[PDB]
Amino acid sequence: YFQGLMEKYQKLEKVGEGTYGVVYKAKDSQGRIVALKRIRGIPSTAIREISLLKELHHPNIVSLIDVIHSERCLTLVFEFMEKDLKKVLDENKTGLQDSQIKIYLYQLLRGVAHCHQHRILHRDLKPQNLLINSDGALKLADFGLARAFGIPVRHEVVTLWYRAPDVLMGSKKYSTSVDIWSIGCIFAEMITGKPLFPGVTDDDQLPKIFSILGTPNPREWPQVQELPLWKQRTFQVFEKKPWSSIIPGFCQEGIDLLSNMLCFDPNKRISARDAMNHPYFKDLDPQI
């Protein structure tokens, strides 16, 4: 049993795990099911997370309903979600059904557009941080690395598989573009069931991106040369693999949308809102 500011919660089964604690299923005194994310320098990270979550009230963003403070641990109380996208991809090793890719991508874009409109960047979008409930609603979660505009950035070993090439090259500037890259990586992962850029080491990351989309050309994107790592490193020059080989047989409008998400120049990359209005979503009800 745990006492919050809003209600009392009865601990049930462990429904997840994490770097600083365990996520459990839980029950309200009145019966309503919830999630308890237990958090063990670390209290500052949890405080940031709560403050950002309290600014983000949207159907496509995991709802924070309460906080339990204990000398030992900070417990976040969320609406319950049955699964996550990593778990969904594990059951579909060769990709998802086309209608589902379309549903999940639209909701992922809508949640991110809400973030961006509220001047917050997620910065850690990946299938395990994309929660899916018992009704198929996709919601953003884990705002642990989120960045509010104008607030300075303040370390855990995480995957660089969804990180934008300019960020991996040392860019530190605030850009909504960093999230759209991750969305592109996720979009491609939902098509094949496999990660688009799974570099073997943190060092292999940029050569892995470049091996698929080509090595960026400074005449096309002049600002590459201005980036820190581009100055202190030499990269093997690659030609872009055709989309016909990356995502074989996927619809033309989906390939066009993906290509606008995965372009190197952050100033040319499609925004979350413009991507929602792309011909690829023509048939989809926006009121989902």
Ligand X SMILES: Nc1ncnc2c1ncn2[C@@H]1O[C@H](COP(=O)(O)OP(=O)(O)O)[C@@H](O)[C@H]1O
Which residues here bind ligand X, judged by CB under 6 A?
Answer: 15-16, 18-20, 23, 35, 37, 62, 78, 80-81, 84, 128-129, 131, 141-142, 144
Query: Residue 61 has what DSSP assignment?
Result: B
Residue 277, annotated ligand binder? Answer: no
Contact of 104 with 98, CB cutoff 8 Å: no
Question: Shortest Cβ distance from residue 64 to ligand X (Å)?
Answer: 9
Residue 7, annotated ligand binder? Answer: no
Contact of 269 with 166, CB cutoff 8 Å: no
Residue 19, annotated ligand binder? Answer: yes
Q: Can you tell me the distance from the alpha carbon of 28 to that of 9, in angstroms, rounded to the nearest whole number?
A: 5
> Hey, which residues are catalytic here?
124
Question: Shortest Cβ distance from residue 33 to Mg ion (Å)?
Answer: 20
Q: Whose Cβ is closer to Mg ion: residue 142's or residue 189's? A: 142
> Angle between the 252-261 and 177-192 helix axes, to the nearest 10 degrees?
140
Contact of 138 with 130, CB cutoff 8 Å: yes
Torsion of CA 155, 22, 126, 101, to 10 degrees: -170
Binding-site partner at residue 101 among ligand X, Mg ion, none, CB < 5 to 8 Å by type: none
Binding-site partner at residue 124 among Mg ion, ligand X, none, CB < 5 to 8 Å by type: none
Question: Shortest Cβ distance from residue 131 to ligand X (Å)?
Answer: 6
Contact of 158 with 102, CB cutoff 8 Å: no
Question: Shortest Cβ distance from residue 197 to Mg ion (Å)?
Answer: 19
Q: After which residues is the chain broken (C to N over 2.5 A)?
A: 40, 154
Contact flags string 149-188 toward Mg ion, x per CB under 5 A: ----------------------------------------
User: Which of 95, 144, 184, 199 is in the footprint of Mg ion by CB under 5 A?
Assistant: 144
Three-class SS state of 23: strand
Q: Whose Cβ is closer to Mg ion: residue 127's or residue 144's? A: 144
Q: Can you tell me the distance from the alpha carbon of 262 to that of 185, in angstroms, rounded to the nearest whole number?
A: 8
Residue 37, annotated ligand binder? Answer: yes
Q: Can you tell me the distance from the alpha carbon of 254 to that of 256, in angstroms, rounded to the nearest whole number?
A: 5
Q: Whose Cβ is closer to ligand X: residue 80's or residue 181's? A: 80
Contact of 78 with 62, CB cutoff 8 Å: yes
Residue 261, annotated ligand binder? Answer: no
Which segments are annotated as binding site for Mg(2+)? 129, 142
Question: Rule CB under 5 A: which residues touch Mg ion?
Answer: 129, 142, 144
Which segments are annotated as binding site for ATP? 37
Which segments are annotated as binding site for ADP? 19, 37, 79, 81, 84, 128
